[PDB]
Amino acid sequence: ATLFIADLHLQTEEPEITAGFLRFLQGEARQADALYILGDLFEAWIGDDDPNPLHQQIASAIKAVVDAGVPCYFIHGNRDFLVGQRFARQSGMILLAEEERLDLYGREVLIMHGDTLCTDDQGYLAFRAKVHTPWIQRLFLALPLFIRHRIAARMREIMDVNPQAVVDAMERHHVQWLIHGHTHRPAVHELQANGQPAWRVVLGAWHSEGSMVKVTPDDVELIHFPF
Amino acid sequence: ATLFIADLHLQTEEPEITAGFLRFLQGEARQADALYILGDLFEAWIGDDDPNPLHQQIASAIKAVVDAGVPCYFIHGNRDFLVGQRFARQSGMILLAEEERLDLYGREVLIMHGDTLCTDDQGYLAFRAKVHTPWIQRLFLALPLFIRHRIAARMREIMDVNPQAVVDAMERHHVQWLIHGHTHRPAVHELQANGQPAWRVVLGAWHSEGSMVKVTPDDVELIHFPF
Ligand SMILES: CS(=O)(=O)Nc1cccc(C(=O)Nc2ccc(S(=O)(=O)N3CCN(c4cc(Cl)cc(Cl)c4)CC3)cc2)c1
Ligand SMILES: CS(=O)(=O)Nc1cccc(C(=O)Nc2ccc(S(=O)(=O)N3CCN(c4cc(Cl)cc(Cl)c4)CC3)cc2)c1
Ligand SMILES: [Mn+2]
Ligand SMILES: [Mn+2]
Ligand SMILES: [Mn+2]
Ligand SMILES: [Mn+2]
């Protein structure tokens, strides 16, 4: 089984979610062939140099899973797009592109975070355009941490996918399977893409529950678990 | 694993749901310790004497599962409260009460259809009161089928659970686990009952997806599958 999670929004304020996640990595995840984290692992990220102890707890727990022979992958979300190569090294996680097309035991599956599909949010697409320009990233990161923190804190209902952008994405990739998070509305959806039945499996956020998508040679399941 | 499904709303108009259900009984269900169907197996029921061929296909598929050594149980829903002992015999399914308290591998779980929890629907509780009076049932059933059909067809958004009725029910049973359908909003909910954390796992309707709850010594999962 290949596992997909997303939208853990981990943070110091919510340590129950953290312990939930550690129990999942210590347990379920070990038996997996691979684990993909499709973004919003962290509620916020201001750079890999952040000393926040949570960052190292997590990277440590994930690394042990990779050290167990189970490869962990990451796609960025809107919350944690600044996660970088140093965090990758600490956690043993391989960073991936915003869209990937997997071959899962013969089945071709498109994964992303899901936020690029929410094209009816004009104004988020402004924000995203800008925070993805390298030189805006490099600028932000070369500030000193204490100012990054102040910029973050001073910055204080999720628009669902545009249906057409979903089709276009599954058609651009010629796939009948899509897995994403971001929208926080866990569900299996049916649609038409490439003139055939297609499915969009949506992961949920981790609050009271956790969730995952489990892909096998024969099946694709979306699973909710309580803690 | 003990499986719980509900809300298949099976009917001649939707044969894809039927084939989906047959594939589940032929496959997943065989490996189970037991299968509980928590109501709305059928979109409508006017009595066990109905010759509708779908009724016998289904009873046949279920019976093979029981004949495989996997006990199947049924709680009535609002749609199929007239399912009776003859259908039980044809299908090998044991009929159960509207609430049961199970011991699942040491864990005490309340199951019901879920409609009795929707107490803010004044007017459904009228309908239910009446159609559950024996002599109103016996009257209806002693009509001739052709008139039952006409009464049914002439009869042509689901109110969610009242939160307090949920607590009261879990408290009446002294349980920290509840499984039900009816509301068609699949989810895991956290709450307080008996002054402890409790969980309410809700099954979904079968349309594009199927769903089930899988209970093991260690875990309670809600699973969506596509067809
Ligand atoms: C579609 S939606 O997601 O529902 N709504 C929506 C709309 C607009 C923005 C967002 C959103 O994610 N905002 C957001 C807010 C804070 C954060 S953060 O992790 O605290 N952090 C990320 C890095 N930020 C940053 C700031 C600058 Cl100066 C330049 C660059 Cl490079 C990055 C500073 C703040 C990350 C993201 C969310
Ligand atoms: C809360 S809700 O479910 O969202 N809304 C709601 C409100 C009120 C009623 C219902 C509802 O389930 N109606 C309903 C309609 C039809 C059916 S049925 O299966 O076709 N069938 C059941 C048996 N019926 C019957 C009729 C009489 Cl004369 C006496 C008796 Cl003994 C039974 C005849 C009709 C079964 C149920 C649903
Ligand atoms: Mn998210
Ligand atoms: Mn997101
Ligand atoms: Mn129903
Ligand atoms: Mn119902």
In a domain, B41, yes or no: yes
| Closest Cβ opposite residue A225 in set B189, B219, B226 | B219
Domain count, chain A: 1
d(CA B156, CA B34): 35
> B184: left (phi > 0), else alpha (psi -120 to 50), else beta?
left
- The dihedral formed by the CA atoms of B62, B63, B68 and B74, expressed in degrees to the nearest 10: 60
User: In terms of CA atoms, which chain B residue is nearest residue A202?
Assistant: B224
Q: Is A99 in the pocket of ligand 1 (CB under 6 A)?
A: no
Identify residue A180 by its one-letter amino acid code: H
Nearest to B209 among A188, A219, A223 (CB): A188
Confirm or reject: Cβ of B141 under 6 Å from ligand 2: no
Whether the CA torsion B40, B30, B215, A2 is positive or negative: it is: negative
A121 is in an annotated binding site: yes
Which tokens sit at B143?
A: 């009509």
Residue B170 included in any domain: no
Q: What are phi and psi of B48, to 5 degrees?
A: -70, -10
Q: Residues B27-33: contacts with CB within 8 Å, 24+ apart?
A: B28/B3, B28/B212, B29/B3, B29/B65, B29/B70, B30/B65, B30/B68, B30/B70, B31/B1, B32/B1, B32/B2, B32/B3, B32/B70, B33/B1, B33/B2, B33/B70
Nearest in space to B4 (alpha carbons), one of B227, B216, B169 = B216
Rounded Cα gap, residues A109 and A113, in angstroms? 13
Chain B residue with the nearest C-alpha to that of A187? B224
Q: What is the CATH number of the domain that holds B209?
A: 3.60.21
The residues facing A222 across adjacent strands are: A213, B224
Backbone angles phi, psi at B143, to 5 degrees: -60, 165
CB B101 within 8 A of CB B110: yes
Closest residue by Cα to atom 18, ligand 1, is A44
The letter for the amino acid at A202 is V
Reading the block at residue A92, the tokens are 């043993």
Residue B225 touches chain A, beta carbons under 8 Å: yes
Kindly tell me the burial class for residue A62, based on how many C-beta atoms sit within 10 Å of its own C-beta (0-12, 13-18, 19 or more): buried
Q: Is B129 in the pocket of ligand 2 (CB under 6 A)?
A: no
Q: Would you give the end-to-end CA distance of chain B in angstroms?
A: 21
Domain range for A210 is 2-226
Which of A188, A192, A202, A212 has the highest number of chain B CBs within 10 A, making it the mutation to test binding with B?
A: A188
Reduced to 3 states (helix: H, G, I; strand: E, B; else coil), residue B89 is helix
Q: How was this structure determined?
A: X-ray
Q: Quick count: other Cβ atoms within 10 Å of Cβ B219?
A: 14
Pairwise CA distance, residues B3 & A48, whole Å = 44
- Sorted by sequence, the CB contacts under 8 Å of residue B225 that are 6+ apart come out as A188, A219, A220, A221, A222, B209, B210, B211, B212
Extract the runs of DSSP E, i.e. beta strands, from A9-69: 34-37
Closest Cα in chain B to A191: B208
Instruction: Establish if B52 belongs to a structural domain.
Output: yes
- Is the Cα torsion angle B163, B165, B170, B172 positive or negative in sign? positive
CATH of the domain at A202: 3.60.21.10
